[PDB]
Design a protein around this ligand. Structure first.
Ligand SMILES: *[C@@H]1O[C@H](CO)[C@@H](O[C@@H]2O[C@H](CO)[C@@H](O[C@@H]3O[C@H](CO[C@H]4O[C@H](CO)[C@@H](O)[C@H](O)[C@@H]4O)[C@@H](O)[C@H](O[C@H]4O[C@H](CO)[C@@H](O)[C@H](O)[C@@H]4O)[C@@H]3O)[C@H](O)[C@H]2NC(C)=O)[C@H](O)[C@H]1NC(C)=O
Ligand SMILES: *[C@@H]1O[C@H](CO)[C@@H](O[C@@H]2O[C@H](CO)[C@@H](O[C@@H]3O[C@H](CO[C@H]4O[C@H](CO)[C@@H](O)[C@H](O)[C@@H]4O)[C@@H](O)[C@H](O[C@H]4O[C@H](CO)[C@@H](O)[C@H](O)[C@@H]4O)[C@@H]3O)[C@H](O)[C@H]2NC(C)=O)[C@H](O)[C@H]1NC(C)=O
Ligand SMILES: *[C@@H]1O[C@H](CO)[C@@H](O[C@@H]2O[C@H](CO)[C@@H](O)[C@H](O)[C@H]2NC(C)=O)[C@H](O)[C@H]1NC(C)=O
Ligand SMILES: *[C@@H]1O[C@H](CO)[C@@H](O[C@@H]2O[C@H](CO)[C@@H](O)[C@H](O)[C@H]2NC(C)=O)[C@H](O)[C@H]1NC(C)=O
Ligand SMILES: *[C@@H]1O[C@H](CO)[C@@H](O[C@@H]2O[C@H](CO)[C@@H](O)[C@H](O)[C@H]2NC(C)=O)[C@H](O)[C@H]1NC(C)=O
Ligand SMILES: *[C@@H]1O[C@H](CO)[C@@H](O[C@@H]2O[C@H](CO)[C@@H](O)[C@H](O)[C@H]2NC(C)=O)[C@H](O)[C@H]1NC(C)=O
Ligand SMILES: *[C@@H]1O[C@H](CO)[C@@H](O[C@@H]2O[C@H](CO)[C@@H](O)[C@H](O)[C@H]2NC(C)=O)[C@H](O)[C@H]1NC(C)=O
Ligand SMILES: *[C@@H]1O[C@H](CO)[C@@H](O[C@@H]2O[C@H](CO)[C@@H](O)[C@H](O)[C@H]2NC(C)=O)[C@H](O)[C@H]1NC(C)=O
Ligand SMILES: *[C@@H]1O[C@H](CO)[C@@H](O)[C@H](O)[C@H]1NC(C)=O
Ligand SMILES: *[C@@H]1O[C@H](CO)[C@@H](O)[C@H](O)[C@H]1NC(C)=O
Ligand SMILES: *[C@@H]1O[C@H](CO)[C@@H](O)[C@H](O)[C@H]1NC(C)=O
Ligand SMILES: *[C@@H]1O[C@H](CO)[C@@H](O)[C@H](O)[C@H]1NC(C)=O
Ligand SMILES: *[C@@H]1O[C@H](CO)[C@@H](O)[C@H](O)[C@H]1NC(C)=O
Lengths: 443, 123, 123, 438, 123, 436
């Protein structure tokens, strides 16, 4: 009675992986390589479509990670190679205009540097932070001398994140989850289709996520497996917490040639008092923020469980401190004042000051062999940013006791991406299909 | 004016009226990633077009053929398939039998290419 | 033969007889510029073929449709359009309304296909 | 009672920007092995009754030619020796043993400590330099590029001689050519034709006069974007070549030293015979006829009662103020004040232009990428055709013109002005009396 | 069945029953060699499809046309051609007349389209 | 009354040249760069199809040559450049543990090398194999100092040949010749179609072909023109000859830092007696194998003709000896002991071997590789699956080991394959007209 009928243009799809390209809208995200965005993007709501999403198996995150690494390397590749700099340094402490915190923190080094002419040498003196310099035996070397070569970042290229929109190729589409309070691993009752993602700023940080999206309704706790003590917890905040970071010291930047066409930048001197870099977090706002986080953690851990916050257990600064790029400088802030409380049964203009260290020799993305020198920046630096989420680890104490402990985590950049790319998945469009009908083909 | 895939989730008999909307959007180191993507869009498009070609459905969004429907693949009623069901669901229900049906569609068209040639020869 | 664009400048009537000549000349880091050139030629070819397919004009150089001509778009006498004007001039005059006509053509074909399916089911 | 009919293969086009590829024909820096050799039989289709508008001043074929030339130039040097070991203190004295006044103080004799094949050994060598490449530090000199760039030695085996390049459109595109002998680069062209590839264009690099280009068929043609605006250059296409003979009379002996494993540096060792300046000869009468023709055409835009005066360039880099070109592989900088010194009012006698020579070349007006042109052994003579001029008009009853130049895109426009690239748009619609039958 | 090109060596008649076996396999610095391989396959595929389209054989495997066969191309009996010869042999035998035949096919279809347009306009 | 009928999908092909890609199922051949292959590749037998093959005009060979060289270079690009080593060396002889065979073979060289800090120098003392060191006039330099730069091969990358499968693009096909006793030039009565070739191991060797395919039934002698003394003869064996190659010395490997994260590897010392590297084959197996070769040569040159074998007449070490990569070391073995014989109508043969660390592969100039020494003792076991012979330019023919052109090793595996393009469109007459 019934016959096979072939249809083309059928609105169906399959989970799929493909390569996405950037659309943008003097940086390290090749925004000049990217195409421009669509001024009028078309978001189509799909009525009566329930789609299952899994943010932990989302390969968009893996593709973003790789793209960021490659873009980074390409922007650095053509810049000055500071191999003439791995020399014996003669260093003493800065004692003039020093406060108590900056005691032995900053060092005054001198060395024999090359010049344009192969035949000549110059004696250069620069200030360095103690984190960049390691003692040889007053004889010091830079920390990278026994593991890597240094490339000076180009002074003309910024490190300020520029939103990146990822776009699917024709034949593919990106499904977006609009379900508020979506925990990122589950069926999503309300979805829409987009061709490009919203603009995601590739902000790099460790313990606290900065300048991301806010939760629509309430703090959202997400993890790959909540009962697994080995997993990280991503917390998306409902309201931002404003954090004010600064390096008060007025740096005078000097530049010399170290070979034909090769300019090296260094801190020459500091004008006035030498003080420690720091970040200020409103005390009241931070206290409200944690109370909200605790109420939500209890949905998984119970009322009878005490929720305790504690500082990181230890390791390299890159995993024990809050790292970020502020004004182009690299800060390592100790967030102990933010995670030092016990909440039992959920129990002005004050502020929390976090001391920060400054480091010029940078080893990003947890790689070995590619090290960067961050030129110093002339003048005084201040930046203001939003804390939009936290990364926490868990010591599973409640198994044996009444108290559970959470500590700042992070350090794996993929988890910072997952923060924004949890609403999206890539699907392939499959326009062909068949179904029985009453229709037959005349011969 | 539902937009691309705006009919998804809609009754199969209703969604079938917007086929043009999806069909017209199938062709819609950093430059290599773009170049590769452009090539894939073309390759996928052409593979589907080739199937329509060998099945004798070239140039049509809706094509009727002479392969009978087998109750083995599905014994559902038309009022249960074209109504009270969407295309995503249908695709899952008969996913197994897709390869079988495609093989039959090809066999049928090849037989009808021969039959047509013989009739013309007789004219 | 007048060559690939040799008909340009002739009247529309005269030029309609050379369509084969223009149609057959479509499709026919340094290696990237060459690949991009090749990919682009393919994409343009396919995009135009797709429109012809959607409109029901599949595999044809000249297709009559069921969309009536609107005097609003142009009210020239057919003798003027076909005997005095060339195609370059014609296209400039009706650069506007191109997407009206194309939208109507897609709609007309969709309706025709639906109606053919119903007749076959009834027969 | 009319119906919409769709036609495919309609002979129409739109102006468009696309990427062109080179074909050229069947070792040299132009990397012609990177092009796909074209069909020995070219085609050109005249388009009868077609008038089309051309605009040479807004033509992206020029921009592509520029970018490809820069790119190949740089690619050519990638595998060549980097002469970083030469940025040393040089201890120099004057070359005075066999000099005429023509080059008094121009050549220098420099000694220095150069690296060798082994890391632990040095060698003392000496070589001759042309002064323009060497600057005083405080007898202590350094090469001119030491405080701005590295120098890559051009590979001695690779020729700089221009090879005609044919630029071809991708399928779906076409190149339209203007055949109007009097066309000045802008506006409607009554007679056009279609080609797939351009004629071969030689990428000749020169700064004031245009060498080895196309000649105008009937009259001298003055072309400019806006002749009124004295901020723009004027391109002049001539009807006769003016033959120019250029030479470096000195017989140079070239030596080579090892500077590192697998690497060597080439330099002038000595000079055989007397030392005289390089120069170019232009026949006076031919030049005077040619210039008079230019003046007549200029009067057509400035008035019959306006005096036209020619003058030498007022200032700028040597690359801009002199006529710079590559002769036999050497880089000459010729003073053209002997050609542009005349006021025009309503028997083997030649003009001699002295020329200086440089070895450290900074091309395409860039900074940070210098090239060392190795010396060529022997005596060099080259003969070329002056086919055009680049002139700049100054801001009364007299107008003043001076040699202009410095932007390479102008040399290209002089060959590419005849062409524009269009996209073919084969799909069209028109009313007919044909109703589809359903 | 026989598999790809398994019919080579079979008679032309027998081989003609496997056309879909071959047709489906026509379409499906380092990474550039891979792109070139993909692009080239597409270009060859499309050029053959374009040519069939011009001839009015779009979407067909066996297309009868109205160009008559000339004895100057080949004067064999049909039983010899279809029962004894294989396609490899046939291709060699008439290689010299390929372009002649193709030119005639393009001309014939252009005339056929003109005739259809006039008849529809006359109705 | 016949009309042209157009058929699409016709089983016809043309000889063609296209780009082939690899599908190869920490290694220099970068198999991670190849696509994964078909777990169960298909082959179609083309019953009643005869096709011609010509192995000497097979461009698959030329592509394999280019791919192999490019892969080689790509693996070396990211490795340390050993330019600080091109210094004057102070060298003495290693005479402490020599047998008479090793007298003067190894040298103990001392030099001032750079270190992590630009400011400091270190004294280094390493052992060299002599062939890598040339006297300057006890002052020596490394052999490459006047012509090339040295790149140290990365210690983490294996040189072990791994099978590479070549695959045709859609629209193309590879025909395979299945005939036994096929010499590579002419009609092949039994052929089949594949999309990908079998895997071919890119084994580099110079006189004997190692680890290739064996002839199905008997020794096959192939050449472009056998009567032309300018051509090489490729002999395929139907039985392997097993060869055991050893470097008996126990090397202790040391390393130093020469720059910012850069390190150099060298032999520090040797434990126990030093002996020359050598290779063993059985005399009987070799004599049977050679006799088979002689019989087949006799078919081509005539009966009651004396067939003599002789050692290579001269040239560079790379062509006068049998070179190969054994465990990562580069051996240069003297095959005179295998080819010293005259043929007319438990006990092994030992071949002395030399070792080099500075390698100029693919007959190139300016790009030289330094092979890090390998710690310990090395033994390799491999199969001789063929020979490369030349014929000396009377009543006696003389054959000598040949080689030096890598294309010949490739041809010995690729002779069975040909690339064709598929031409699916064609026409034929039939009694069918199109209705109008
Ligand atoms: C979270 O998001 C906030 C923004 O919402 C980010 O904060 C911004 O950070 C950038 C980069 O540090 C700031 O931009 C810089 O401002 C300097 C100060 O001058 C400003 O104000 C004067 C007076 O009104 C204006 O005249 C001037 O134009 C500026 O608007 C400038 O001196 C800087 O320019 C110099 O450096 C750049 C380096 O890229 C060079 O390209 C320039 O040529 C020049 O040499 C620069 O413009 C910006 O002002 C901050 N915004 C706010 C609101 O404070 C946080 O950084 C981000 N968080 C994280 C972790 O990234
Ligand atoms: C405008 O156009 C003219 C051409 O009309 C250009 O002038 C030519 O310039 C090239 C160099 O760039 C000259 O080429 C050289 O000629 C030397 C002499 O050639 C004679 O002898 C050979 C036989 O040995 C004959 O075949 C030839 O016809 C002559 O009788 C050669 O010795 C040179 O070869 C050596 O140097 C090159 C360097 O690249 C190496 O590659 C070679 O292997 C070899 O070592 C070379 O061929 C040419 O002769 C000039 N022609 C004329 C008529 O003078 C102008 O330069 C051009 N204007 C501009 C601005 O570019
Ligand atoms: C996010 O929310 C979903 C929905 O409540 C949770 O999904 C449940 O997971 C368990 C364990 O695998 C299944 O047995 C249930 O059937 C799932 N529920 C539903 C409705 O399907 C998911 O575990 C939550 N994730 C986190 C980290 O809390
Ligand atoms: C972070 O810095 C901002 C300024 O950039 C502070 O906001 C100001 O607070 C004063 C309070 O007297 C108001 O008068 C200003 O109008 C505010 N300025 C702006 C732009 O809002 C903010 O309080 C600081 N926060 C912390 C934690 O230090
Ligand atoms: C989603 O489901 C709802 C409920 O079935 C659909 O709403 C019905 O639509 C039909 C057709 O227009 C109306 O006749 C019914 O009266 C509607 N039902 C109700 C309760 O209002 C809706 O159309 C579906 N969405 C899509 C995209 O198909
Ligand atoms: C050619 O250049 C002249 C000079 O800039 C242009 O004329 C000027 O036009 C502006 C208005 O845009 C007036 O304010 C100036 O006073 C005019 N100057 C002179 C000398 O006339 C002229 O329009 C340009 N022509 C073209 C075709 O570009
Ligand atoms: C440039 O050189 C050419 C020769 O290369 C000169 O042409 C010669 O002119 C003289 C004039 O008496 C004749 O005797 C020669 O026979 C000519 N030679 C050729 C090749 O025909 C030309 O005059 C020179 N021009 C200038 C101004 O230097
Ligand atoms: C390989 O075998 C082919 C035969 O398959 C030999 O080719 C013949 O050579 C003779 C002598 O030149 C010719 O007369 C025949 O006509 C050739 N036959 C064919 C089919 O081409 C070839 O010489 C052999 N080569 C070797 C090295 O053994
Ligand atoms: C720098 O300060 C530290 C503080 O612990 C002290 O031990 C060290 O001796 C000081 N060095 C100099 C040169 O004053
Ligand atoms: C800092 O240096 C200034 C001179 O520039 C001096 O007047 C001032 O007293 C110093 N302050 C301290 C704390 O050493
Ligand atoms: C933090 O908030 C809780 C209520 O959520 C309140 O009981 C507690 O006193 C607050 N702590 C501070 C320091 O304000
Ligand atoms: C150009 O117009 C003339 C009539 O003046 C006509 O004879 C000729 O055929 C036209 N050219 C073209 C290409 O149509
Ligand atoms: C190392 O350098 C010194 C001079 O500083 C020299 O006397 C000594 O011979 C050199 N040693 C070697 C092994 O080259």
């Amino acid at each position: 009675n019934l016959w096979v009928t072939v249809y083309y243009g059928v609105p169906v799809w399959k989970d799929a992986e493909t390569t996405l390209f950037c659309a943008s809208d003097h940086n390290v995200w090749a925004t000049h390589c990217c195409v421009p965005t669509d001024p009028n993007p078309q978001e189509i709501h799909l009525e009566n479509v329930t789609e299952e999403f899994n943010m932990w198996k989302n390969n968009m995150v893996e593709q973003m990670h790789e793209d960021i690494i490659s873009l980074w390397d390409q922007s650095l590749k053509p810049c000055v190679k500071l191999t003439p700099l791995c020399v014996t340094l003669q260093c003493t402490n800065v004692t003039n205009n020093i406060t108590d915190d900056m005691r032995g923190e900053l060092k005054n080094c001198s060395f024999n540097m090359t010049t344009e002419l192969r035949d000549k040498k110059q004696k250069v003196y620069s200030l360095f932070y103690r984190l960049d310099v390691v003692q040889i035996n007053k004889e010091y070397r830079l920390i990278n001398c026994n593991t890597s070569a240094i490339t000076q970042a180009c002074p003309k290229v910024s490190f300020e994140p520029i939103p990146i929109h990822y776009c699917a190729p024709a034949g593919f589409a990106i499904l977006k989850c609009k379900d508020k309070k979506f925990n990122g691993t589950g069926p999503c009752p309300s979805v829409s289709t987009v061709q490009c993602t919203h603009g995601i700023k590739p902000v790099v940080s460790t313990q606290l996520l900065l300048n991301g999206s806010l939760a629509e309704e309430e703090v959202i706790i997400r993890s790959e497996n909540i009962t697994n003590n080995a997993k990280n917890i991503l917390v998306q905040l409902n309201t931002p917490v404003q954090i004010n970071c600064t390096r008060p010291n007025n740096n005078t930047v000097k530049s010399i040639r170290i070979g034909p066409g090769q300019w090296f930048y260094y801190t020459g001197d500091i004008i006035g008092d030498i003080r420690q870099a720091h970040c200020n977090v409103s005390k009241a706002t931070w206290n409200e923020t944690l109370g909200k986080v605790v109420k939500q953690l209890r949905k998984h851990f119970g009322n009878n469980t005490i929720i305790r916050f504690a500082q990181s257990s230890g390791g390299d600064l890159e995993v024990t401190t809050h790292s970020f790029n502020c004004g182009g400088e690299f800060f390592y802030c100790n967030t102990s004042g933010l995670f030092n409380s016990t909440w039992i049964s959920n129990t002005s203009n004050d502020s929390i000051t976090l001391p920060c260290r400054i480091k010029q020799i940078i080893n990003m993305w947890q790689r070995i062999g590619q090290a960067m020198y961050a030129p110093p920046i002339q003048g005084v630096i201040r930046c203001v940013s939003n804390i939009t989420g936290l990364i926490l680890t868990r010591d599973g104490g409640s198994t044996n006791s009444t108290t559970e402990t959470f500590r700042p985590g992070g350090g794996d950049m993929r988890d910072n991406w997952r923060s924004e790319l949890y609403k999206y998945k890539v699907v392939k469009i499959e326009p062909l299909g068949v179904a029985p009908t009453r229709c037959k083909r005349r011969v | 004016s539902l937009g691309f895939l705006g009919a998804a989730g809609s009754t199969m008999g209703a969604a079938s009226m917007t086929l043009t909307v999806q069909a017209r959007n199938l062709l819609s180191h950093w430059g290599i990633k773009q170049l590769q993507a452009r090539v894939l869009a073309v390759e996928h498009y052409l593979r589907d077009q080739q199937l329509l070609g060998i099945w004798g459905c070239s140039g049509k969004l809706i094509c009727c053929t002479n392969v009978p429907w087998n109750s083995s693949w599905s014994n559902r009623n038309l009022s249960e398939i074209w109504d009270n069901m969407t295309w995503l669901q249908w695709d899952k229900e008969i996913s197994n039998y897709t390869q079988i049906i495609y093989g039959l569609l090809e066999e049928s068209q090849n037989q009808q290419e021969k039959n047509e040639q013989d009739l013309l020869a007789l004219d």
